[PDB]
Amino acid sequence: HWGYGKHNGPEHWHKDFPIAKGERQSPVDIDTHTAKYDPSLKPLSVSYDQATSLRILNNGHAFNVEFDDSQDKAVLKGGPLDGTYRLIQFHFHWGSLDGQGSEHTVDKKKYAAELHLVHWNTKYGDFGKAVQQPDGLAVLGIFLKVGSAKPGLQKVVDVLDSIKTKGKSADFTNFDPRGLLPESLDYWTYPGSLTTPPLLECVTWIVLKEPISVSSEQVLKFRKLNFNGEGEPEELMVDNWRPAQPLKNRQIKASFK
Ligand SMILES: NS(=O)(=O)c1ccc(S(=O)(=O)c2ccccc2)s1
Ligand SMILES: [Zn+2]
């Protein structure tokens, strides 16, 4: 029943997923002044050389680029993590206008969009088991601002017209996610949740300080996707973000400065 509108949007989710009002929900505002620099945090290790993408899917909430995670390829480790987490998919959240779209905010600043690279902890054997553990996932979040084009994003933007409506899929091989990363891997980190139903409190969040630039034409093409399936009234896929949730007892740590 869940989505992003007036009647089924974030404000409604708690009725099917009571965890929505939990103790470690995401996203949050990142208060850059009360985030603690932690000199014991390691550099983040992002090893995407051997990433193998499989498909791209419109699931009626976002589009997901999925990876073959059957071998030890495309791993995130280091930083705040105690193990090897394996890339399984990425997706974005974005707005109807360039002034909103990100789920995390930085001193209340909303970026145009946010990229989520989702990884699961290899100690749990697969993604489906990992999501039922408190340290099962690590999600790398990267903000998008509108400015220069991101060349490495263009393959994704070009396939969107083939997956316009909810339930459509496309073969999407050999996409290199290193093309979506900014220069610096300086990050903030905190314990939280999936930002969509089922809202499971299983994520270590690593949010990069440095946004990537994408062009207005690139983000306009995200906005041409649809929430609805083929043959229903057209509902543009925009404003698929959850707003900041209460930090509650939590500390956000910074890897820098
Ligand atoms: N926006 S986010 O990165 O926090 C996110 C929401 C849902 C996912 S999941 O599709 O991997 C998933 C995980 C468990 C159950 C169902 C879907 S990841
Ligand atoms: Zn997400």
From Swiss-Prot:
Consequence recorded when altering residue 62 to F: Reduced activity
Domain Alpha-carbonic anhydrase: 1-256
Catalysed reactions, semicolon-separated: hydrogencarbonate + H(+) = CO2 + H2O; urea = cyanamide + H2O
Keyword Cell membrane attached: yes
Phenotypic consequence of residue 139 to G: Weakly impaired activity
Phosphoserine PTM sites in chain numbering: 162, 169
Phenotype when changing residue 194 to F: Normal activity
Subunit structure: Interacts with SLC4A4. Interaction with SLC4A7 regulates SLC4A7 transporter activity. Interacts with SLC26A6 isoform 4 (via C-terminus cytoplasmic domain).
Name of the protein: Carbonic anhydrase 2
Organism of this sequence: Homo sapiens
Gene name per UniProt: CA2
